[PDB]
Amino acid sequence: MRTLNFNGKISTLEPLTVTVKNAVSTSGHRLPRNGGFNAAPYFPGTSIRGTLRHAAHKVIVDRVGLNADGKSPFDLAEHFMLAQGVDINGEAETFAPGEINAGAELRSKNPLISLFG
């Protein structure tokens, strides 16, 4: 139980672009600016978070591997729980909203869900 802060630099080997609905207009494709066109753009943390969540999901599937049938053990519900984080079958541990520290069992049993809620 330690807060690991990773601080560091991303050097861009090939240009780093992202399409965002607000950033892109009929004037043309622009990066998110946090202001006007003169402001300094930023690569959203959402895109990096999604990329790292997809990478973590790939790690989890590879660590689990496939069944004897050659099919992934995850169904659509589990797959969306691990990738997008939303319950599709309505079967999820609805913890009390006033319990900041809830889900310790799920957090221990599912480290992907723990990292990316």
Add this chain to the structure above:
RNA sequence: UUAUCGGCGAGACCGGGAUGCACCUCCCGAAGGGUCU
């Protein structure tokens, strides 16, 4: 931090034509010399 969760993405050759060239003397002036078996 008024909660909890969400990669925006996928495709495209921008290329196709061109002589930069045509004229000019850079020359005009000079002793490097004298000394020692």
